[PDB]
């Protein structure tokens, strides 16, 4: 198109046509020049810790992020979307950016003068090989703003690559994003893409309405027999006892199927004063070691966040917490919002608790029977599990690594798995050199105009819906909004503008029977 003429249109809603919903999120977006369009070599400072250690590449590019879900459902529809559905999945993928302004800034004596520059062009390009390492999937800022009226700073992207302590290794790779082809566009010119999601498993967006320990006819006795003593009863000499299982020892019932695995996670307590008064949020921490680095499993394996009437009690760095509006990087539990992950009772172990007792020795007339406690169980025939939960400001899906082999694809922060998931789509302002001298030098340019970009970016997904079909009597728990008097609504703005999530909403309301 041409300067005068609007290269696309605002296109913000969500339609819901029975087995798929598609929702359209438009944003402004701002992309200043990053680097000063150079690529910067970037480590970690001498005095880092060896597991901070890093080494690695920033660039002068910006990048597009959507992978939360609040920058596509709004709370109505979130709720809409959880309290009518078992499940759902991405299918497909519509991206645009249009009404693209590239602006000139010059500073005199202090005062900055913004003019529009309408023949300077802007660089996009999607990496639809996966040709460049994947940075979408590490829950970092600079997303969609879940409001649709505000505008947002194009985060800048950069990469990691193999490090040994601060120094690079031969094996480390440095990728120039100029190398990949890339489309120019000025003010008239528009960008589009589309993208089709794998076949992945929905979302559990339920909750188990029955435990695994408890599948048995509460009625009904066992045909099979158990150990119920070792010893007689009223003379305990020696004997062994035979019972069949019932009601009444729901406990020594036999079963089919197991709890997830386990990797046990320390307690915390809400209410400080329960905690033991020392710092050990780094060595009492859960941690794997990684070319003798040690590194968080936040959050680590899908867990249970605490049992029954334990609400207060969470897993030292076992849950997703997010932050309230306007919380700064560093504050008090008072300031965010802990996730949790209860709902999972049912089949995942609890994020604090052992998995169990295992034999450790064989007993005898002279040797007693022993057992020590599992702390960690890996993946054992018969297991069962649910995934963590997604939540309206979680992340969406997660890049699966290019390796030889995996267990259970899916990510643990949560959402969905993908080999190929959305490609990152990378955004430059072209550089614009300043009036260059009128001799011929061979010296590297270092003078630029000062230029930003502005525009609009549209993402369109399009996802599955699993109904659900409980035959469910009773009534089933629903997300509502309180309807006692506040001063603010919720999901809202407050009188300075400013739009507030007070809590995170989860998937898992309706229930299924396990």
């Known amino acids: 198109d041409g300067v005068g003429n609007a290269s696309g249109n605002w296109h913000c809603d969500s339609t819901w046509l029975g087995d798929r919903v598609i929702t359209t999120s438009t944003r402004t977006w701002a992309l200043p020049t990053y680097n000063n369009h150079l690529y910067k070599q970037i480590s970690s400072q001498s005095g880092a810790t060896n597991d901070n250690h890093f080494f690695g590449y920033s660039t002068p590019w910006g990048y597009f992020d959507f992978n939360r879900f609040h920058c596509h459902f709004s709370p109505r529809d ?5 309290n009518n559905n078992w499940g759902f999945r991405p299918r497909k993928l519509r991206f645009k950016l249009f009404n693209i302004q590239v602006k000139e800034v010059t500073t005199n004596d202090g005062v900055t003068t913004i003019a529009n520059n309408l023949t300077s062009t802007i660089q996009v390009f ?3 090989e996966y040709q460049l390492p994947y940075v979408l999937g590490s829950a970092h800022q600079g997303c969609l703003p879940p409001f649709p009226a505000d505008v947002f700073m194009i985060p800048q992207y950069g990469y990691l690559t193999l490090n040994n302590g601060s120094q690079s290794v031969g094996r480390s790779s440095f990728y120039c994003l100029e190398y990949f082809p890339s489309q120019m566009l000025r003010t008239g010119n528009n960008f589009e893409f589309s993208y089709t999601f794998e076949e992945v498993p929905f979302h559990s967006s339920y909750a188990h309405s029955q435990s695994l320990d408890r599948l048995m006819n509460p009625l009904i006795d066992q045909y099979l027999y158990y150990l119920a003593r ?5 003379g305990s000499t020696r004997e062994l006892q035979f019972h069949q299982a ?3 020892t729901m406990a020594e019932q036999s079963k089919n199927w197991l709890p997830g695995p386990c990797y046990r996670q320390q307690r ?7 905690n033991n008064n020392s710092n050990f949020a780094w060595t009492g921490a859960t941690k794997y070691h990684l070319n003798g680095r040690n590194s968080l499993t936040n959050p680590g394996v899908a867990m249970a966040t605490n049992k029954d009437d334990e609400d207060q009690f969470f897993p030292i ?3 997703l917490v997010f932050g309230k509006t306007g919380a700064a990087n560093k504050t008090t539990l008072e300031n965010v919002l802990m996730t949790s992950e209860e709902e999972i009772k049912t089949t995942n172990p609890v994020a604090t608790e052992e998995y169990g007792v295992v034999s450790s020795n064989l007993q005898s007339s002279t040797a007693g029977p022993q057992t020590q406690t599992v702390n960690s169980q890996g993946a054992l025939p018969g297991m069962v599990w649910q995934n963590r939960d997604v939540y309206l400001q979680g992340p969406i899906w997660a890049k699966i690594p290019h390796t030889d082999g995996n267990f259970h694809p899916s990510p643990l922060m949560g959402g969905f798995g993908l080999k190929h998931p959305p490609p990152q789509i ?3 302002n072209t550089p614009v050199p300043a009036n260059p001298p ?4 061979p010296a590297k340019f270092a003078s630029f105009i000062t230029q930003y970009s502005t525009g609009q970016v549209s993402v369109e997904i399009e996802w599955e819906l699993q109904k659900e079909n409980s035959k469910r009597w009773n009534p089933e728990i629903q997300y509502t909004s309180n309807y006692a008097k506040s001063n603010n609504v919720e999901f809202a703005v407050n009188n300075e503008g400013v739009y507030t999530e007070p809590r995170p909403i989860g998937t898992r309301y309706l229930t299924r029977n396990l």
């Not at 070792?230 to 009223?234: A, G, P, R, V």
């Open 230 to 234: 070792t010893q007689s009863t009223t």
């Open 268 to 274: 915390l307590s809400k209410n400080i004063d329960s």
């Open 438 to 441: 009128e001799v011929f030098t």
């Open 246 to 248: 019932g009601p009444n």
């Open 126 to 128: 999607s990496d639809s």
């Open 426 to 428: 990378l955004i430059k």
């Open 317 to 319: 760095n076992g849950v």
């Open 78 to 82: 979130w709720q809409r979307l959880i």
